Amino acid sequence: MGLHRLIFLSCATDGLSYPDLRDIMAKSEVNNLRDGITGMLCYGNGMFLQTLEGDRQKVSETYARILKDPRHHSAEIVEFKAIEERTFINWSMRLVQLGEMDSDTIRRLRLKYSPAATFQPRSMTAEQCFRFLKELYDMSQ
Amino acid sequence: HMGLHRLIFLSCATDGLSYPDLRDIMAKSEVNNLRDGITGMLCYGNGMFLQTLEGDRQKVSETYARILKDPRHHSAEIVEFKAIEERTFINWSMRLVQLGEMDSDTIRRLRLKYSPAATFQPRSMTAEQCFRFLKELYDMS
Amino acid sequence: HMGLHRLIFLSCATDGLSYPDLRDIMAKSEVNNLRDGITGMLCYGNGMFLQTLEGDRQKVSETYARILKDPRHHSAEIVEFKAIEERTFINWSMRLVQLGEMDSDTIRRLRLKYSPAATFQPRSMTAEQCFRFLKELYDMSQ
Amino acid sequence: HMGLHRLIFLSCATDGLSYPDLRDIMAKSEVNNLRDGITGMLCYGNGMFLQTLEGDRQKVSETYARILKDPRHHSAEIVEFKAIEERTFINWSMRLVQLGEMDSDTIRRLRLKYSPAATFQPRSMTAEQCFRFLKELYDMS
Amino acid sequence: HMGLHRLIFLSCATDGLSYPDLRDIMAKSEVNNLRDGITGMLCYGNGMFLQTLEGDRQKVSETYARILKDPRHHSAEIVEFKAIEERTFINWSMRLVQLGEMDSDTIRRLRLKYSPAATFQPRSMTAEQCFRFLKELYDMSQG
Amino acid sequence: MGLHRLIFLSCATDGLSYPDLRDIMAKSEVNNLRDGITGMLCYGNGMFLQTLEGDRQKVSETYARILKDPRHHSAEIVEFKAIEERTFINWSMRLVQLGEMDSDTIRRLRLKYSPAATFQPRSMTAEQCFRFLKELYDMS
Amino acid sequence: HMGLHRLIFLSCATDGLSYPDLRDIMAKSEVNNLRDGITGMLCYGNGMFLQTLEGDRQKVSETYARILKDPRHHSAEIVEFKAIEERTFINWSMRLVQLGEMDSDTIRRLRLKYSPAATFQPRSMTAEQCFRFLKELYDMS
Amino acid sequence: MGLHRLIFLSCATDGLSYPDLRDIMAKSEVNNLRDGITGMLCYGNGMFLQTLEGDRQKVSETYARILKDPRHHSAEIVEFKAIEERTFINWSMRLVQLGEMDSDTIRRLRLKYSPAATFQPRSMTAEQCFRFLKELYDMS
Amino acid sequence: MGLHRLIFLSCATDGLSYPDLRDIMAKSEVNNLRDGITGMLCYGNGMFLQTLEGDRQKVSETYARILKDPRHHSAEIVEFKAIEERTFINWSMRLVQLGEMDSDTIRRLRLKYSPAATFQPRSMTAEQCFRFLKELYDMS
Amino acid sequence: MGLHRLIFLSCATDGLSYPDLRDIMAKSEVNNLRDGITGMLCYGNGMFLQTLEGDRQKVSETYARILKDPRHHSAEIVEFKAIEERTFINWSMRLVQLGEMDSDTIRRLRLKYSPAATFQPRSMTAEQCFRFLKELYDMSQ
Ligand SMILES: Cc1cc2nc3c(=O)[nH]c(=O)nc-3n(C[C@H](O)[C@H](O)[C@H](O)COP(=O)(O)O)c2cc1C
Ligand SMILES: Cc1cc2nc3c(=O)[nH]c(=O)nc-3n(C[C@H](O)[C@H](O)[C@H](O)COP(=O)(O)O)c2cc1C
Ligand SMILES: Cc1cc2nc3c(=O)[nH]c(=O)nc-3n(C[C@H](O)[C@H](O)[C@H](O)COP(=O)(O)O)c2cc1C
Ligand SMILES: Cc1cc2nc3c(=O)[nH]c(=O)nc-3n(C[C@H](O)[C@H](O)[C@H](O)COP(=O)(O)O)c2cc1C
Ligand SMILES: Cc1cc2nc3c(=O)[nH]c(=O)nc-3n(C[C@H](O)[C@H](O)[C@H](O)COP(=O)(O)O)c2cc1C
Ligand SMILES: Cc1cc2nc3c(=O)[nH]c(=O)nc-3n(C[C@H](O)[C@H](O)[C@H](O)COP(=O)(O)O)c2cc1C
Ligand SMILES: Cc1cc2nc3c(=O)[nH]c(=O)nc-3n(C[C@H](O)[C@H](O)[C@H](O)COP(=O)(O)O)c2cc1C
Ligand SMILES: Cc1cc2nc3c(=O)[nH]c(=O)nc-3n(C[C@H](O)[C@H](O)[C@H](O)COP(=O)(O)O)c2cc1C
Ligand SMILES: Cc1cc2nc3c(=O)[nH]c(=O)nc-3n(C[C@H](O)[C@H](O)[C@H](O)COP(=O)(O)O)c2cc1C
Ligand SMILES: Cc1cc2nc3c(=O)[nH]c(=O)nc-3n(C[C@H](O)[C@H](O)[C@H](O)COP(=O)(O)O)c2cc1C
Secondary structure, three states: OOEEEEEEEEEEOOOOOHHHHHHHHHHHHHHHHHHOOEEEEEEEOOEEEEEEEEEHHHHHHHHHHHOOOOOEEEEEEEEEEEOOOOOOOOOOOOEEEHHHOOHHHHHHHHHHOOOOOOOOHHHOOHHHHHHHHHHHHHHOO | OOOEEEEEEEEEEOOOOOHHHHHHHHHHHHHHHHHHOOEEEEEEEOOEEEEEEEEEHHHHHHHHHHHOOOOOEEEEEEEEEEEOOOOOOOOOOOEEEEHHHOOHHHHHHHHHHOOOOOOOOHHHOOHHHHHHHHHHHHHHO | OOOEEEEEEEEEEOOOOOHHHHHHHHHHHHHHHHHHOOEEEEEEEOOEEEEEEEEEHHHHHHHHHHHHOOOOEEEEEEEEEEEOOOOOOOOOOOOEEEHHHOOHHHHHHHHHHOOOOOOOOHHHOOHHHHHHHHHHHHHHOO | OOOEEEEEEEEEEOOOOOHHHHHHHHHHHHHHHHHHOOEEEEEEEOOEEEEEEEEEHHHHHHHHHHHHOOOOEEEEEEEEEEEOOOOOOOOOOOEEEEHHHOOHHHHHHHHHHOOOOOOOOHHHOOHHHHHHHHHHHHHOO | OOOEEEEEEEEEEOOOOOHHHHHHHHHHHHHHHHHOOOEEEEEEEOOEEEEEEEEEHHHHHHHHHHHHHOOOEEEEEEEEEEEOOOOOOOOOOOEEEEHHHOOHHHHHHHHHHOOOOOOOOHHHOOHHHHHHHHHHHHHHOOO | OOEEEEEEEEEEOOOOOHHHHHHHHHHHHHHHHHHOOEEEEEEEOOEEEEEEEEEHHHHHHHHHHHHHOOOEEEEEEEEEEEOOOOOOOOOOOOEEEHHHOOOOHHHHHHHHOOOOOOOOHHHOOHHHHHHHHHHHHHHO | OOOEEEEEEEEEEOOOOOHHHHHHHHHHHHHHHHHOOOEEEEEEEOOEEEEEEEEEHHHHHHHHHHHHOOOOEEEEEEEEEEEOOOOOOOOOOOEEEEHHHOOHHHHHHHHHHOOOOOOOOHHHOOHHHHHHHHHHHHHOO | OOEEEEEEEEEEOOOOOHHHHHHHHHHHHHHHHHOOOEEEEEEEOOEEEEEEEEEHHHHHHHHHHHOOOOOEEEEEEEEEEEOOOOOOOOOOOOEEEHHHOOHHHHHHHHHHOOOOOOOOHHHOOHHHHHHHHHHHHHOO | OOEEEEEEEEEEOOOOOHHHHHHHHHHHHHHHHHOOOEEEEEEEOOEEEEEEEEEHHHHHHHHHHHHOOOOEEEEEEEEEEEOOOOOOOOOOOOEEEHHHOOHHHHHHHHHHOOOOOOOOHHHOOHHHHHHHHHHHHHOO | OOEEEEEEEEEEOOOOOHHHHHHHHHHHHHHHHHHOOEEEEEEEOOEEEEEEEEEHHHHHHHHHHHHHOOOEEEEEEEEEEEOOOOOOOOOOOOEEEHHHOOHHHHHHHHHHOOOOOOOOHHHOOHHHHHHHHHHHHHHOO
């Protein structure tokens, strides 16, 4: 039924540590590679913003799995639509931490695509979330 | 906030699904969706569920997260999630439409109009086809 | 003289607003707006105000700055201000529509049509949703 | 949360406006705008102000309502207020540009480029001209 | 021959304009415009003229140069001049519409519809607003 | 009511002299700077092709004065419309004479934007006159 | 072949054209155009011809090449030649409409609607005006 | 992969019989109903013009089978694309014979959508074939 | 009525000689220069493909004279429409012989804009002919 | 009737050999050159994906011949439409084998234009097949 892209956000569980983030990256890369899924996970200011690209069914099944994870709560879908080609091609999953990135670059990128004084993905539109993640992916290459 | 959205998803009915089960689903959704500002429509046929929800980005997502935990269906597949200027499915907090209790010639034309399948197969339908199929049902009701 | 414009804004009615308040707002609004070439419509429901004003860029702005000084409401939020080819809200210099003095079902369906909320919440509505909500009310009030 | 918006307004500076008065304005705007997630640009020339603010619909409104109470100007005119997909005035929570301290030729050409007036007259300019005028100022900083 | 065009302009009527003045204008516009393949409509109201002319690029220009020389009005403003695929104002070489001989409420709402002004002020209206205002006048008073 | 552009053409009156041109350019520069008007005047093959940018009322009044000038006759308006920004920014008024340019570059420019073997602005559309003038202005 | 096309051209009647000439033109046109799959419409008025032919790119061209050798007119000028998705002038292999036998006011308004002229002057008309002019004449028959 | 529509044309083999047409119609109706396929068959002037809607795979497989039928030759694909909704809903396969309908209606229809003096789908674009088949279908 | 472009094709008459080609080019340069006409004539595979830009009347009359020339036959109009600017500016008439150019540049060009295994303008659309001719002109 | 493009896919019959491919390329190179046909053949993961550009009739007949070939089975048409210009100009027929290429560029190219974890033209849209083929043609010059 074709290639799709999903974008959703969520609130991280309190006290998340680096080993927790690395654990997410490690399982996501293996499962996604198996499932034909690509994407990117953005972490900052206690919030997750993720995009997954792939088959309509596979991406749905992965999202239903991600909802069971106790490392986050209060998930919101931002968008689900058919896409002509992938944007997030290179990584089965890439984690980007806004805190390990140039303070100035991120502030300008977060301002560019958002009205918020901090990283607040609930205040961004679907196209803003996409373009935010696209620039993170393009610089994190 | 963030605005009005519509979700469209499909799923498989669990084997043994009973009319009571159908009525229990409708009873709880109507109370919940009314509380949440959610309207929409549930189509059941050929062992398949095809549903749409309209409302707040967060609320619809939370309702979908709850629906994913229901054992009365399995293998849910998201069809689309996007922002909308206005609602189509205004009249009912949640309306159940059974394809089997309907004019066989009306439903045959409808299912053919918006799908390539010889029976009702939402998995073979695009997001636009599911929207238009459901809308004709809503209008016919 | 920069053409015809439309402003849309919303606000919270102040606690204790009474029918005399609504009449005073309408009485001054009709006189000022007729003087200023301003037309529009004010919607009241669920403790919220939703209003649109059409006219000259300077006049409408001046009318809005006066409105922000009015103690009969608070927490104003601008929804949209843009140039327009033609007016939609032609007939009245100002018209009050109370959502509660109307067919509950017609309004319930309209409030659902153009918003995600279980109640009248103009802060949850877009500029296009506010305009189309207001236009349908205007078309029914004729 | 109804998304990112841009406000543009103009006003007349009250007589006697002083250099310390402008610096005070710039000092409070940077603090307030940074607090509120707001960015923008203030233009001063020919006794007139032309400013733009980007950010949240509610915050920008509340900021305009505060600016309207300031005795250092009068006769404000809204030029446009609308939703935007991305910010243009990303770099400064607030920046002052004095047209009088700029190349008489660079500013004269820019003033003619975007208005029919022989002097700076933002009231004679469309929303698009004010935007494009302020943007070139922004790009020259 | 560069095709069909439309001109829209406005002006202030000179003080003391009389009904015979409007009649001399109308009798002469009809004869000249019929000769020159020009059609159009003149609106008079609130001491202001708002007129449109359709025809050949050169003919319309010359008629405007003639109109500019007339002492019966002053302070003309061009609102628009462009090529058009087809005429809107076809039925009359020139038709005069006086806003005062028409339904106040009909004209009132029409003037608000296409302008920000509390009275008829073509100087506050765009080319498109002027076009649409004149077109509704032309359509309603087909007589 | 915003920034507008006018383009018109005309026939020069027989006996046009440089002094004649000197008076035109001198009063135009003064008058246009006062009025917020910019533009360009093209002369060639006995024809004027002009563009003026500025306020709707000002540009019109200037056109009315230009129509009284006896140094030319048979004006035609080419277009009058609103514009987002000026193209002809640099000069309150600039004269360009086609005859004092490469017999090759202008031949082309003209042929590019007209069906005629000589400069015949009555044969050009509004968009052809604009682009033709924009190319001339862009050269200086 | 290479598709359905429409040609529109105009010409001046050779001075002294007679009714029998027009008859003979119409009789050859119906026979030839019917043989060649060509349809169209010929307007005559004020000493001018305005005609359109629809059909094969080759057939219409050759027929036009034959019309060019006819001494009953001169000064032919092509108005338009392009590919078309469907015919407008379907009903007749060739139909003659004389502007001289029509409601004097109907023809006056039609000529004014699609021309800057006080007389029928097809040389003063664009390709779209000729098309719309002939189409209205066709619809009144 | 979704709903598609195919259009193809061919020459009927010499000797085509009404019984021949009926075997085609009967086997097509059964197979297409099995295959979720709908469509329309046009026959005139010795030519076939057909459209099928359904699954990309299914429609292709049916076309491959049509290519082996000896009752026609010189098949030519006209169009194959994804479609949002079916136009040819009502019948799995419906035969419309051009030659036995109103002579004037089919003359106008065939002229409307083609440069030819007889039915010649080889002279028609994809859109012409589609709009032609659709007007036939709408008349049934 | 402004600037137009014509595109047409024809078959060269049997026996066409280089002097014949040189005379066509010679009279075309004079007539077109007088008539304000520019364009390009492409000769290949025994076929002519030409385009002319200029005034609507002049271009037509020139086409009518071209139709009486016995050095070619079977003319087909490809397209005739209004244009905003000339593409074939530099030359009142220029010959491009496909045979005197790189077989590979021309082979690739001919495939890009046609379904044919050789140069066959009768198989090309108006847009394909224009773009074909424009690439020749730009590389010329 | 102009230039067209066909795209189709099929399953290679079991046991396909290098000689098998050489014979396919050999006749296709000859036949397409005779027919004015250009195109490209992609082989990978036991699947064929091909495009042919040329005349509507010739391309159709070449497809009819290809369907009789027993070296593949289960052919599926992807798209057939008229085109303004060719994309695959340089070759009458060129074979590209995905396994004789860099796992990365092919893997990422294949992910770019499909949801699948391996090459599966059956899950690809018409526009994805075209773009997949076009990047292959562009790389192998
Ligand atoms: C924010 C977040 C994003 C995640 N994204 C993915 C993902 O994209 N793919 C994935 O396989 N698991 C993802 N996970 C982890 C799953 O929730 C879960 O732990 C994982 O799929 C375990 O899979 P298993 O049950 O098959 O072993 C994510 C978890 C979090 C908290
Ligand atoms: C096909 C299907 C559709 C459902 N749709 C909705 C719905 O629209 N809204 C809702 O509140 N529950 C819906 N449910 C039910 C949820 O799974 C769950 O039973 C419900 O939210 C229970 O709410 P509770 O928190 O009051 O127990 C649906 C269940 C199924 C099987
Ligand atoms: C919700 C609301 C809407 C209002 N709308 C208008 C209006 O459209 N026009 C107006 O003149 N005043 C309006 N007002 C009132 C103004 O704030 C102010 O009281 C009024 O202009 C005072 O007029 P005056 O000082 O000239 O007598 C509104 C007030 C409220 C609370
Ligand atoms: C032209 C002008 C522009 C201003 N722009 C801003 C601004 O962008 N943000 C802001 O907070 N204040 C701005 N101000 C200042 C406000 O009028 C006011 O002094 C400030 O919002 C006070 O905030 P407070 O309640 O924290 O004292 C501006 C004042 C002027 C005269
Ligand atoms: C508002 C106004 C509109 C006019 N419109 C026209 C017109 O459409 N056609 C026309 O010939 N004269 C029109 N005139 C009159 C001309 O100024 C002038 O008197 C007239 O063309 C004299 O024509 P004649 O000298 O060629 O006889 C108009 C005058 C006014 C004041
Ligand atoms: C072709 C041509 C173009 C002209 N353009 C302008 C112009 O752009 N601005 C201007 O003020 N005068 C222009 N003029 C001259 C005016 O017609 C008139 O002589 C001048 O405005 C008178 O200036 P004054 O009113 O100060 O005496 C032009 C004259 C000609 C012949
Ligand atoms: C204005 C005009 C329009 C004509 N239109 C057609 C036409 O549409 N079809 C046609 O066959 N002949 C038309 N003709 C006639 C041709 O010039 C020619 O005389 C006729 O095609 C001769 O037929 P033939 O092939 O038997 O010699 C027209 C002639 C004139 C003067
Ligand atoms: C013009 C024409 C159209 C046909 N269309 C169809 C068709 O739409 N569906 C179909 O199943 N067979 C169609 N056929 C018949 C096939 O060629 C073949 O006989 C049929 O699929 C046999 O099916 P079988 O597997 O049951 O033997 C058509 C034949 C012709 C000549
Ligand atoms: C393929 C071809 C193209 C021609 N192109 C032109 C042309 O562009 N301009 C032109 O004047 N003659 C052109 N001609 C020649 C005319 O047919 C005729 O010979 C020429 O115009 C001389 O006529 P004249 O001396 O009466 O002017 C062309 C001839 C052929 C065969
Ligand atoms: C995947 C695949 C692609 C093929 N592509 C072509 C092709 O593009 N052109 C062609 O002539 N044959 C192609 N063939 C081969 C034909 O099936 C047949 O072998 C060939 O056309 C020889 O025809 P002929 O010997 O009758 O002349 C292809 C075969 C396969 C398996």
